Amino acid sequence: YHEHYMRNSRAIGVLWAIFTICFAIINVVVFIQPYWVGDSVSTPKPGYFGLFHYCVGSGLAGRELTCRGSFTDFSTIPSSAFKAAAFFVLLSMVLILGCITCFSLFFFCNTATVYKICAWMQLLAALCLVLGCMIFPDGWDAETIRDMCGAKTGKYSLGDCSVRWAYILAIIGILNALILSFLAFVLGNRQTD
Amino acid sequence: SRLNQYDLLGQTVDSGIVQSSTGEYVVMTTHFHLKRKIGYFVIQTYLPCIMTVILSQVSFWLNRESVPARTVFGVTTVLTMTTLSISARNSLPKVAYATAMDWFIAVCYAFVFSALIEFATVNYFTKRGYAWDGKSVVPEKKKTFNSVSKIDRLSRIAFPLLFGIFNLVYWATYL
């Protein structure tokens, strides 16, 4: 019975590592790709915008998407809420990459403590991702966001613009991060047995 | 000849026809052939880089117990190569592609880095913290002393030989 226990522990730990890498990829993708929100048929102007980067059409029956906004520049970001959300998502990226680095500690340190270290680190990363996702709609009142979506759009109000794949992917990342953190906690305790 | 950088080898004079949307036009052409003067870059860039590489390789001939000394060689030669590289690139037109001098400096920088890594590998295997005292006899295999590192003995041949053949192929290629 003990060898089945240990083999299942090893396999589940390996799987937890792959899913941690998958969530890290999700975090990088959602931070980079600007498809958190998108235009609609009724939108005054076309385009899309993410945490910091936003592209908008000129409005002459073509694309001509003028694009602006990089996280390295803290001024081009439309609003302070967007800046806070981008900072929180970046901190979540750093935390999850830190746990993937802490996979290196499995050689020397006791397995339980490193499992708990990634557990707490993934929980903190998930908390940061939740804070970013909750703070991001607060910035929809910005004059650029209003000019794109229209006057009806506002704080915590989508209006005509529709959420694109990146936002729901970030929510999925939030759920994944919570459950990966709990998985790491239980794995770290189950190594002790 | 008001040329400082180049030497005017000669000129070639010719004539031709150039096409255009407006029509065909006669074009009288001259071509002045210029060859760059190499001595300045040899004395200013290539020679100090070669001497820095030689200094980096000189570290292999010291006893393995002089850990601060060999570390100081490695890192200060790295810093010297960095300074030489920056200076050599400063006085050159700002082209984004790599020239021959850039490749030479890159290979020299890699050689210096490799010499420092070689010392790190040698020091990882050093056992005793004390060097030979001179008076005591070393029984070939304090009472016991560290042997001369076979890594150092191999590097003493490998590094100068590799740098020499690199110089041979480089100068044969570009000259």
Binding site: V29, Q33, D73 | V75, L79, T82, A96, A98
Partner: protein
């Protein structure tokens, strides 16, 4: 127009990476070789300070971080962290129903620090892993995702 990266690859990316590797070399130097490790760390820091000067020679004085600036900054933090790691090591060596509770099912308050002597063993693999992960996210980000 698209910029060419050959000069920047040869001149600043590869040298900065190599200086970071030389900073890692301190972790394999034997402890108690205090002058050697201290000199190595601080002189690698000086070399990164020298290398960071040429990052912005071509550009105007824009007030945002470029990709080159970010790479150089991260490498500077890496060498700084290596030196601080050795400093810490030297200082500490010279001198209800889930399973249990909210102190044993989390925060490890049973023994934990104690094992600081093995900090070099951690940094030997932690630092290359962190730098390799940073390069994977760095290069994939600037080339493919955006």
């Amino acid at each position: 127009l698209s910029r060419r990266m050959g000069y920047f690859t040869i001149q600043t990316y590869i040298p900065c990476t190599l200086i970071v590797v030389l900073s890692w070399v301190s972790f394999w130097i034997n402890k108690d070789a205090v002058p050697a490790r201290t000199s190595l760390g601080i002189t690698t820091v000086l070399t990164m300070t020298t290398l960071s000067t040429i990052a912005r020679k071509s550009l105007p004085k824009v007030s945002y971080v470029t990709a080159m600036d970010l790479f150089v900054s991260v490498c500077f933090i890496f060498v700084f962290s290596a030196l601080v790691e050795y400093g810490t090591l030297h200082y500490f060596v010279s001198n209800c129903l889930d399973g249990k509770d909210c102190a044993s099912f989390f925060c490890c308050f049973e023994d934990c620090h104690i094992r600081i002597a093995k900090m070099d063993s951690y940094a030997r693999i932690f630092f290359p892993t962190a730098f390799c992960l940073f390069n994977l996210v760095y290069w994939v980000s600037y080339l493919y995702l955006g």
